[PDB]
RNA sequence: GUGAUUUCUGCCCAGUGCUCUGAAUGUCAAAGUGAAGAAAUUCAACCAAGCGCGGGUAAACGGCGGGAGUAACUAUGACU
RNA sequence: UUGACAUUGUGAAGAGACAUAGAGGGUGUAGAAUAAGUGGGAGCUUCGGCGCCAGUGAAAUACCACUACCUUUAUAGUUUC
RNA sequence: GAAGACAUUGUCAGGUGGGGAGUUUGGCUGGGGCGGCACAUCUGUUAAACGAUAACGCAGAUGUCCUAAGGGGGGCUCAUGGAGAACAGAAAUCUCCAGUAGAACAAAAGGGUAAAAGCCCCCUUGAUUUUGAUUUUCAGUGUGAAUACAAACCAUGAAAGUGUGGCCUAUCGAUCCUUUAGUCCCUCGGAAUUUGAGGCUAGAGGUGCCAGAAAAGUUACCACAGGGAUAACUGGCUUGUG
């Protein structure tokens, strides 16, 4: 008895210039969403370097980065999945696939979005929620009425 | 290294079938229970372990299963013989709470249909999943009798809030070697689902229905 | 870089104190029997500028 | 000039980095505010009162 | 469990001989253990009482003695 | 990719030189023990003054790893390794696909 | 650091620094402790500062955007 | 800067942790119910009855173990502040 | 007089540490820089009817996907159009006729394929073992890909046969280090036994700058060796633009 997993790092290395706005980037072993970018020439026969400002989505924390524009950067392979909420249990929301129903591990989102989700489920009005999965961590990001 | 091997389990399962098969022969079919317990797993912090394993034989052979099916699933249930629970009495049942409580508490395993599985939350309520019983999907191609045996065999190790878990392995009159193989397979499945494996298993009890709780580890 | 001004300041030479016009060190009378048990009388005779 | 001080270099006269040096810094780095628990104009005014 | 009311013990406060009631009253202090003298905890004390209670009569009801 | 848990393939054992049944697992790498000669050489070379002495790899370009299956024969308990190509996703014994089943979005 | 006198020094503590009698070990070396072994050894807990989590500080480094609708000429928009 | 060992001897007092076996416990509704939880369980036994079914409730009562948590008892001692 | 087995000091271990020390800061390129990858590959054309053939020529594509979309066997014919049949219409399903492929064959383009290489069904694991030979790039080296056999053991089919992955052309990686599999194999060199370690045979962990360094800037304060192989004047050829 084992668990099969092909070796797949959740980062494709791409490029400092190929990272764009609303992006996904790995700054110091955390997923983050590129919210600001700027190219900047350094010298007089110099090259351009990229300054990146991004927000870590699982904590919502601002992380910055500086690199020469010709260097490679890790890009997380995020997967957004659209699931169905059965019931909000003791902080750990119960979730449903297209047919399967495992997904019982996602912490109910602690923000005001999750509080309004709790109010919705409490007066019923059943929803489908959107969950992001990236580099080992998963989080509910956005509720949506079916 | 597998901390639990066959030999000690051979001896403990000899003494288990000893106490069941002559000492207190009862008036109903008892079931072997593996009760496991964790040490370092904090339920609020770690990733929840969840997993089902199809057994090579049968546990409790008289579980009470209910079929949420439409036409083909319902007709197959009428052919085999399992209580089929169609959308008819489901929408005739919607306007209550006590009756859904009665249904969920009365039949223990629920089996569903692919085209019913999405509005089971709607038509029913959260009570089934809250109890720990969500209807398992069954396709039209899938033979209903075979999948009924599947669901009467599947063992589920899944953390909910606590650190003691308990799973029925099998009956008490089936043969010694398959009981040994099953209990070893279930232990190994638990250890495989864990993070630190044998380091974080701490409690390993086998029982049937009564006082004697025959420890393995 | 270069050794900066405060490091040079601690390394002595130019950054010492100018003690040419200074009087003696301004210290109290040392402890003895007269001050420890009774009292001793001195006379302040010249107040000057350090 | 940048050789003579941490603050140093130019094209514009500015500190460049934060002027609050650590307490645990080394010689040649302690050019600024040495272990500043607070900065800016103070009001006010108690330390131990 | 700390059970301080059995950890402690009672003591009897008495008055100077100018008054007539010899018994003033009772107090309570922790047991005299090591490194902490309950007796010093007793000397650190000032107590308030009524002169009507000290002199018996009601003519001295307003007056209070520390 | 999906590969079954069982496979009838050639066995190299001297008691069974024919096609026999094999269970299919995945090769997970070993513990990288501390007393290997290269590790002892690395410890002695890194000890002292001088800093890092051998190169450390930085410019990763490939995301995938070739999967290699460990086959254990069910009779002679002999093992073999079979290499399968670069696949991002891998499931040992997943559900078989259905030819013409009703799509479910 | 700014650069006489007069007048004033607005907002932002997210980032980067700096700081703390904030909180629990989440991670955490050597030495020490326990289990297995014939030992070399392996695996555990316990684990200092630090890092991380929290608070403060801008006469610390610094920063200080947009887009719509809206008033009897029209136009702008006090306002939303 | 922090920790260990050495220099480094001689003593107390109070706490905390570990160390193995027991014992006992866990009362907002509603339910007649003193519902810590999970799991099997339609039988159970002491031969009285209990339990299921009924009702009730967020979850059920017999037979049962297990899990942590709390309290002490036995508690050689080790170890830290 | 004060402190007191604390602190200092000695040795290890962790943190911090541009204060300081070394070192680095790819290539191609109608100058260099920014851009791009023409740096490892694949299709059509340029390419001048064997082969070879350039440009930062043109139009595009690759770093995947599949236990079936691999292998064998069998039944059927595919786009499209016409005529019809309740709801039903332009188009839902069913027939009939015509239908050389105008469809499909995972993906870019080209080629190939009709009682199939397409679409459904049945069985399977030739996507296996042992090494050799050959073709392509080529130095006739390596890597990758592929071809035909041999000795086995299999799958399929009634059988002939076919099958050593994808109908063909692309889909990928040396030394050193680590790890796994094989026989029951060799060595630990005074002689033995066990763990341990080192070997032999085959794989994987990866070098995309893809025959494979471990690597950020600035310099108008600059320095050196050079270069008209190379830019900023003039001259020259050309005249789009004026
Ligand atoms: C850094 N240390 C020396 C320290 C110092 C002080 N106070 C001072 O500044 C000292 N000044 C004095 C000596 C009082 C004059 C301190 O006040 C503290 C601490 C330690 C922290 C440690 C905390 C810790 N976790 C949360 C990081 C922890 O695990 C515990 C614990 N449960 O054992 C703590 O005690 C801790 O939470 C804590 O409270 C600390 C202090 O209070
Ligand atoms: C504020 N003081 C009272 C304090 C309290 C606690 N304890 C707590 O905070 C416990 N409270 C909780 C519940 C954990 C939040 C503390 O835990 C601490 C400290 C301060 C320092 C004391 C330090 C001291 N040093 C500076 C000479 C010392 O005696 C030692 C030592 N030789 O053991 C220290 O290591 C000390 O740095 C230290 O650890 C402290 C604390 O952590
Ligand atoms: C009684 N507590 C408040 C205390 C006081 C002092 N110092 C004093 O008495 C003087 N400080 C005052 C005057 C009260 C401000 C203390 O000096 C200390 C301590 C506590 C201990 C705590 C120790 C503990 N260890 C054993 C795990 C702990 O929790 C920590 C920690 N990681 O925070 C310690 O560091 C601890 O070892 C420690 O250092 C303490 C003290 O030194
Ligand atoms: Zn075999």
DSSP chain C: ----HHHHHHT-GGGS---SS--S---PPPP-HHHHHS------------
Token duo for residue B211: 């006082």
> Which residues of chain D are within 8 Å of residue C1 when distances are taken between CB atoms?
2-4, 28
Contact of B108 with B133, CB cutoff 8 Å: yes
> Which residues of chain C are within 8 Å of residue D9 when distances are taken between CB atoms?
none
Residue A9, Cα to own-chain centre: how many angstroms? 16
* CA angle (A119, A125, A127) in 5-degree steps: 90
DSSP lists the bridge partners of residue B139 as none
> Which residues of chain C are within 8 Å of residue D4 when distances are taken between CB atoms?
1-2, 4-5
Q: Is A145 on the interface with B (CB under 8 A)?
A: no
Contacts of residue A144, defined as CB under 8 A and 6 or more positions apart, other chains included, come to A82, A127, A128, A129, A130
Asked whether the CA dihedral A15, A21, A27, A29 is positive or negative, the reply is negative
Burial of B216 (0-12, 13-18, 19+ CB in 10 A): middle
Helices then strands, counting H and E runs in chain A, come out as 1, 10
Contact of A33 with A57, CB cutoff 8 Å: yes
Find chains touching chain D: ≥3 CB pairs under 8 Å: C
Between B72-80 and B144-151, two packed helices, what is the crossing angle to 10 degrees?
70
The closest of F36, A118, F37 to B126, measured between CA atoms, is A118
* CA angle (A83, B193, B214) in 5-degree steps: 130
- What is the rounded distance in angstroms from the CA atom of residue F3 to the CA atom of residue B24? 48
Give backbone dihedrals phi and psi of F3, rounded to 5 degrees, phi first: -135, 140
Question: Which nucleotides of strand H come closer than 7 angstroms to any CB of the protein?
Answer: 1, 12-14, 37-45, 53-60, 63-68, 71-72
Contacts of residue C5, defined as CB under 8 A and 6 or more positions apart, other chains included, come to D4, D5
Token duo for residue E23: 């018994």
Burial A98-110 (b: 16+ CB within 10 A, else e): eeebebbbbebbe
Rg of chain C, C-alpha, whole Å? 20
CB atoms within 10 A of CB F71: 20
- A8 → closest Cβ in F88, F91, F92: F88
Nearest chain D residue to C6 by CA distance is D28
| Helix, strand, coil distribution of chain B in percent, nearest 5 | 35, 20, 45
- What is the rounded distance in angstroms from the CA atom of residue D18 to the CA atom of residue B139? 66
Contacts of residue E60, defined as CB under 8 A and 6 or more positions apart, other chains included, come to E51, E52, E54
Between B6-18 and B176-193, two packed helices, what is the crossing angle to 10 degrees?
130
- What is the rounded distance in angstroms from the CA atom of residue B74 to the CA atom of residue B83? 9
- F55 sits in the region (left: phi over 0; alpha: psi -120 to 50; else beta) called beta
* Centre of ligand 3 from the C-alpha of residue E35, in Å: 21
Burial of A88 (0-12, 13-18, 19+ CB in 10 A): middle
The closest of F60, F58, F79 to F69, measured between CA atoms, is F79
**B202 CA to H63 C1', in Å?**
27
Burial E24-52 (b: 16+ CB within 10 A, else e): beeeeeeeeeeeeeeeeeeeeeeeebebe
Contact of C9 with C15, CB cutoff 8 Å: yes
Record: contact C7-D28, CB cut-off 8 A:
yes
Contact of F73 with F16, CB cutoff 8 Å: yes
**D24 CA to I7 C1', in Å?**
21
Q: From residues 9-38 of D, list those within 7 angstroms of strand G by Cβ.
A: 13-24, 33, 35-38
Contact of B144 with B77, CB cutoff 8 Å: yes
Q: Which nucleotide does the CA of D25 lie closest to, via C1'? A: I17
Give backbone dihedrals phi and psi of C32, rounded to 5 degrees, phi first: -150, -175
**D44 CA to I117 C1', in Å?**
89
Residue F39, Cα to own-chain centre: how many angstroms? 23
Strand I–CB F44 distance below 7 A = no
| Helix, strand, coil distribution of chain E in percent, nearest 5 | 25, 30, 45
Token duo for residue B117: 């599985």
Q: What is the DSSP string of B156-212?
A: EEE-SSSSEEEEEEEESSS-HHHHHHHHHHHHHHHHHHSSSGGGTEEEEEEESSSS-
The closest of B31, B35, B64, B8 to B173, measured between CA atoms, is B31
* Centre of ligand 4 from the C-alpha of residue A78, in Å: 43
Record: contact B139-F101, CB cut-off 8 A:
yes
- What is the rounded distance in angstroms from the CA atom of residue C48 to the CA atom of residue F91? 97
Token duo for residue B43: 């339920």
* Centre of ligand 4 from the C-alpha of residue F26, in Å: 18
Helix H or strand E encompassing B143: none
Instruction: Please give the order of strands across the beta sheet that includes A23-26.
Output: A23-26, A31-41, A48-56, A61-68
* Centre of ligand 2 from the C-alpha of residue F26, in Å: 51
Q: Which of B139, B142, B143 to mutate to test the interface with F (most CBs of F within 10 A)?
A: B139
Token duo for residue B90: 């489901």
Contact of B64 with B106, CB cutoff 8 Å: yes
Q: Are strands E8-14 and E23-30 parallel, antiparallel or unpaired?
A: antiparallel
Record: contact D5-C4, CB cut-off 8 A:
yes
User: Running DSSP on this structure, what letter comes out for residue B18?
Assistant: H
* CA angle (E46, E52, E57) in 5-degree steps: 150
Asked whether the CA dihedral F27, F29, F30, F36 is positive or negative, the reply is positive
The closest of A102, A106, A114, A116 to A139, measured between CA atoms, is A106
CB atoms within 10 A of CB A10: 17
Q: State how far the alpha carbon of E27 is from the alpha carbons of C34, D18, E16, E24, F34, in Å.
A: 51, 63, 17, 10, 72
Q: Is C1 on the interface with D (CB under 8 A)?
A: yes
End-to-end CA distance of chain E: 36
Contact of A77 with A134, CB cutoff 8 Å: yes
For ligand 4, an ion, list residues with CB under 5 A.
Answer: F 11, 13, 16, 20, 73, 75-76
Let me know how long chain B is.
Answer: 217
> Which residues of chain C are within 8 Å of residue D31 when distances are taken between CB atoms?
4, 6
Contact of B9 with B180, CB cutoff 8 Å: yes
Asked whether the CA dihedral C15, C20, C21, C25 is positive or negative, the reply is positive
Helix (H), strand (E), coil (C) string for A36-89: EEEEEECCCCCCEEEEEEEEECCCCEEEEEEEECCCCCEEECCEEEEEEEEEEC
Strand H–CB B25 distance below 7 A = no
DSSP lists the bridge partners of residue F2 as F91
* CA angle (F98, F99, F101) in 5-degree steps: 65
Task: Identify the experimental approach.
Answer: cryo-EM
Helix H or strand E encompassing A122: helix A112-122
């Amino acid at each position: 008895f084992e668990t099969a997993d092909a070796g797949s790092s959740a980062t494709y290395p791409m490029q400092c210039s190929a990272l764009r706005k609303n992006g996904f980037v790995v700054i110091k072993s955390r997923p983050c969403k590129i919210v600001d970018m700027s190219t900047s020439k350094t010298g007089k026969h110099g090259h351009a370097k990229v300054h990146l400002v991004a927000i870590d989505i699982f904590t919502g924390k601002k992380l910055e980065d500086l690199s020469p524009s010709t260097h490679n950067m890790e890009v997380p392979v995020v997967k957004r999945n659209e699931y169905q909420l059965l019931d909000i249990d003791d902080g750990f929301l119960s979730l449903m696939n297209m047919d399967g129903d495992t997904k019982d591990d996602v912490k109910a989102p602690e923000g005001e979005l999750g509080d309004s989700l709790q109010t919705a489920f409490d007066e019923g009005k059943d929803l489908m929620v959107t969950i992001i999965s990236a580099m080992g961590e998963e989080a509910a990001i956005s509720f949506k009425e079916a | 290294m597998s901390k639990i091997t066959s030999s000690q389990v051979r001896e403990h399962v000899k003494e288990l079938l000893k106490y069941s098969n002559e000492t207190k022969k009862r008036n109903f079919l008892e079931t072997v229970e593996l009760q496991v317990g964790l040490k370092n797993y904090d339920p609020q912090r770690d990733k929840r372990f969840s997993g089902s394993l199809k057994l090579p034989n049968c546990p409790r052979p008289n579980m009470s299963i209910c079929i949420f099916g439409d036409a083909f699933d319902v007709d197959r249930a009428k052919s085999c013989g399992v209580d089929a629970m169609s959308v008819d009495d489901l929408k005739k049942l919607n306007k209550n709470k006590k009756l859904i409580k009665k249904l969920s508490k009365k039949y223990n395993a629920f089996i569903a249909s692919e085209v019913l599985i999405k509005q089971v939350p709607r038509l029913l309520g959260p009570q089934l999943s809250k109890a720990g019983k969500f209807p398992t999907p069954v396709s039209h191609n899938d033979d209903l009798y075979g999948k009924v045996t599947d669901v009467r065999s599947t063992i589920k190790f899944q953390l909910k809030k606590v650190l003691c878990l308990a799973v029925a392995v099998g009956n008490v009159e089936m043969e010694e070697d398959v009981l040994v193989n099953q209990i070893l397979m279930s232990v190994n499945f638990f250890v495989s689902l864990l993070k630190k494996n044998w380091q974080n298993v701490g409690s390993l009890v086998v029982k049937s229905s009564m006082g004697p709780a025959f420890r393995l580890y | 870089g270069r050794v900066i001004r405060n490091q040079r300041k601690g390394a002595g030479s130019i950054f010492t104190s100018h003690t040419r016009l200074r009087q003696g060190a301004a210290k109290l009378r040392t402890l003895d029997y007269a001050e420890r048990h009774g009292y001793i009388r001195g006379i302040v005779k010249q107040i000057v500028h350090d | 000039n940048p050789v003579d001080h941490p603050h140093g270099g130019g094209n514009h006269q500015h500190i460049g980095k934060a002027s609050t040096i650590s307490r645990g810094a080394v010689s040649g780095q302690k050019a600024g505010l040495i272990a500043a628990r607070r900065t800016g104009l103070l009001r006010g005014s108690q330390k131990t009162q | 469990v700390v059970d301080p009311f059995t950890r402690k013990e009672w003591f009897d406060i008495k008055a100077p001989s100018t008054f007539e009631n010899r018994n003033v009253g009772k107090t309570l202090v922790n047991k005299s253990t090591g490194l902490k003298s309950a007796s010093d905890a007793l000397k650190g004390r000032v107590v308030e009482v009524c002169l009507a209670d000290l002199q018996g009569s009601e003519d001295h009801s307003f007056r209070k003695i520390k | 990719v999906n590969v079954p848990k069982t496979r009838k393939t050639y066995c190299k054992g001297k008691t069974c030189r024919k096609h026999t049944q094999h269970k299919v697992t995945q090769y997970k790498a070993g513990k990288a023990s501390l007393f290997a000669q290269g590790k002892r050489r690395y410890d002695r070379k890194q000890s002292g003054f001088g800093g890092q002495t051998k190169p450390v790899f930085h410019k990763k370009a490939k995301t995938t790893k070739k999967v290699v299956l460990r086959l254990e024969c069910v009779k002679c308990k002999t093992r073999a390794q079979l290499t399968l190509k670069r696949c991002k996703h891998f499931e040992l014994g997943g559900e078989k696909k259905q030819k013409g089943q009703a799509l479910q979005f």
